[model samples]
Target: NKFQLGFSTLSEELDLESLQVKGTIPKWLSGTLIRNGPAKFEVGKEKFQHWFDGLAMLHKFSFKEGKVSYANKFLESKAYQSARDTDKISYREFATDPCKFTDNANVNVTKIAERFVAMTETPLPVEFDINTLKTVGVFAYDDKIESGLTTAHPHYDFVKNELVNYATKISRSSNYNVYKIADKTNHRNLIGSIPVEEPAYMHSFAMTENYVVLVEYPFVVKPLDLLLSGKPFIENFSWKPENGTRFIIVNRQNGNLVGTYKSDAFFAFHHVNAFEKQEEIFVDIIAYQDSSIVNALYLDILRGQKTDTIPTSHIRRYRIPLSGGQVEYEMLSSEAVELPRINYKQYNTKDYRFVYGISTYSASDFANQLVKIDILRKSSKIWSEKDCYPGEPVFVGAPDATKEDEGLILSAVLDATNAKSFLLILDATTFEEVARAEVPHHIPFGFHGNYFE
Candidate 1:
């Protein structure tokens, strides 16, 4: 019953100046942590089919001095507004209505150039105000790139102040188009393209110092089926394990496909990190045996439908040799993990040691534990509490941090026992609870977020 609470819809929104902090609030930790996820699950009498089909809501927790404040608001996307006004399902979500897709930016929150936007698997990104958590408007590119389907996760370059991501262009012969946008500019310029007969359903990709890696899994969709098939967007994909998985290495500078390597069949939703080593690139991800994990997340199964269970995941590493040979991979962490994060400002696109994520203790339960793994040591630590579920763990480094795990991790946790939520903080090195700020209402489970100082 506790795990079921995570699937329940949340409708109330509030702005509280101060929450009840359990322990000491680090004076050094002063910034805003914003999150994006689905909140409203139905319009009028129709309920969404999948957990990801709810309306987008933005949650903001700001830290100042020694106090933490909270605010939550619904993103006024065209989908949310029209559905509310008409009392009907007006847009095609991931699985709700399959006719015409609407811009429901409910997956994650990130900064595009100078603007903060809530984004999803679609190309649509809805800009929102940081302080008030109010939706501004739709963010459109100056030039037409015709991005049919885009990724929500993009690699942010702290040094170059650039963001790089790829999009799938659905055509007779589809292509994976890669592009980059800068820090203070609003333009997105083309970087490279990879032609594919059937574009794999990629939720995220990997980026090292020199190469952009695309993990093309076997769960692929025919370009025409996307247009002709009346099934939900994701239902068009077919799991053809015999096709195997391919890694497409593109030069970050020129956008040319430098290498294409194949490996056994697997699937992934997120990449932990990737870096370049001696004539090789090492990529890390949370891998599954197949794409059954996708169907296990339907609202019916998650809400109590009798089913087998969700598949277990592992943290895996693939060593791709630039010399052109067979790729080798080794298991980094045997423990199940998902929604991985690292010290992005310091270790992204570079060789690093630590990875923080949430883990499911059992296949029948949701992610109930917060996990931290040291790939160099092949060791992991977990923090869990009864009747509580934690979302993605976001690391916020100290102002003048020296080591990799110098700062703390912030995660918004839902306490099903009390039917409320709280902002959970833990020491990055020790994986121990530093503090927790309790909220008055439950914050439904979300995918990803970022911290801004």
Candidate 2:
């Protein structure tokens, strides 16, 4: 593939300071934006079979006063380090397997229990120092959590001051463990343990003010197949549309299953936001038609592929009546979008007005813009360039701000046409560029991260 995404199995780490800025960055913004994703794509002479099978790399863009600094490193996971030193594949990745398998810890980065850590679906979170951008070791929650697949998209509940996540365990039967960790106490609480007929491969879920929402799509795999098929976890799943999708809601106060609702089949990678009002609860998500997005995301298509249309997504709302067992859903925005984020400070439980995400270009069929969408008015504002591709927009609200969208949007922009990358700061109210911090070299495309101020 001629497309250089900066995924060098060798080394592509750098530490640069005083990065060139095109515009003025607001002094109110002072924090580090850390992003983690797959960076290395090969093992000796063998290459990763799927785009999701690469080694994990962590990147950072630190902002202070008016300047920005950059740094990155390959998280020395058991698999990444072993493969690099021996020049052989020893890791069992999401979609592929080699001589031996280990945790990648490559999908997202977050601050948990006053420590910075890199995360994937795996149970163990790799503890890393934010100041040095170095991996410390595996964060085991004081060795309370067992080794398994924990979600990368963890929901932080400000009211309870806890982080909620789900894990799909590979046992004789398909089982899920949904839990929460207290922010003040650093204590783990089991919200729900569900045993399903088939375990659905899910990347993210939803959380309202009073409940944890889990989506059960038909794209599932049997525990027996994962143990005996000799295939990757992802390859074993197929869309069983007849089974449809179910929404399992668990109560926060009692950690008990409150309601189980069923609806037409759909797949979602990220949820915009959710909240409950009286007898009804709303869970907004970026829903795809099916699992076509995962199947189409292969290295074979990275070089460039010919297709009639691209896999698109939308902002859809799944309305579940708490009093009844039925669920209703509708599309909020007609245009295609993904990677939605909100202010999150005082709005995760209330009626959130603004949702920010990347907009796709129809011609190139890639996510191209950082848009500000109004949930109540059903409108959007866009900030897009001809060839610039931006990652997920992280919102940092102004100190003591009163209104929503009164903050800045931060994202890592990869100028593909120029073969360079940078950090972009935008005004959330207007969705316009406030500043740009250019990196020294090209950065491989990455997944999700967090902003620590």
Candidate 3:
């Protein structure tokens, strides 16, 4: 199966000049689409126990003129290299007690404070050259960073030209602290912090124009369990369904609470999008009942022990009213999907009509379908193939683009049948492939990325 193929590492370092394109490429599409994932899975004889433990491998897709180039590089972080030299698991990953030094930071890669960095929820961010795809070092934003774990999926506000993210610290005074970094000054100021006795594992949050929403799901762990328990970081967590989901909304301008609301218990791996209309704020997510998805997401799927047909969910929207307390909720799309995205240039922090994401089902399904959903119309446009599995669809609109769907979507597709990977380009409006960049080896399914234009 494809999940088994994903377990095999891409050994040869690729530096192909012009990628083999299947369809005609767009002239206006010029920039780099970089993806980071756990490419190097095993550390010598001791293979990683979890999928997230593989050493950070970077795949670069550079589009120039009408052609594209593909390259892959493993971050030479100390932890990564040490395990390479000794041939043993030397570091602890999110779930595996192997270790840390890159922050191993295999989860996601993007830009921060003028430097292109590979980051996770860890306190550190490691910088790398975009063109060369070489590791620079830990990005020293010590002045801007607080005492906590910052999320890999930090929200980039192009309109404000600023960056907003939060970090959860399991310290004596446990708090989920949000930071707003000024692009010009590179100053990261503490906007606000929500004190909690037992903090939930808030992977990614939602950001609207006026407020930053932290949806604290019931999946939580006592701070002491993380410190004293010899278990891996993730094992410390326990799903507290009775606690429900808390929406801790903070004012972006002054770092104050707008309001706090709670909804029925549900878990989410990804938050699609969020915006405000009138006095209500909306948060859309790929919701699951509990943490059963995590267990099915491992190498066990390769053994055929885990099956698809797990309980499914739709794209859910949480309509949080800023004034009165209750949050109205509904399903925007009936399809089970994740990795939701929209037009980067328009329709954020406001009423948005469209959301683009991968559609899938069950454990280790590795989504083969890419969908564009009209939230208002309750309709969708889909793109898929027989055995091609794609990652998050990042939308890059044309120059001075006016329409909501006037953009090109870029995604890394793994040909599970062929044991190879390629970068897929699609028309955001039509949901059709316009171009493709082929790579020699299978690129493991990745998490998040950024377009460095």
Highest-TM-score candidate: 1
RMSD of each: 1.5, 2.0, 2.0
Every model's TM-score: 0.97, 0.95, 0.95
**lDDT, model 2, position 405:** 88
| Index of the highest-lDDT prediction | 1
Residue 437 Cα positional deviation in candidate 3, in Å, after optimal superposition: 1.8
Candidate 3, residue 20: lDDT = 85
Name every residue pair that clashes in candidate 1: none
Q: How far off is model 1, as Cα RMSD?
A: 1.5
Residue 84, model 1, lDDT: 78
Model 3 per-residue lDDT tens digits across residues 242-285 = 98899999998799888889998888877777888888888987
- Cα lDDT of model 1 by residue, 258-289, tens digit: 88998899999999999989988898989999
- Looking at model 2, residue 381 earns an lDDT score of 89
**Candidate 3, superposed: residue stretches over 4 Å from native:** 99-102, 184-186, 302-305, 309-313, 362-366
Ranking by lDDT: 1, 2, 3
Predicted structure 3: lDDT: 0.79
Scored by Cα lDDT, where does model 1 land?
Answer: 0.87
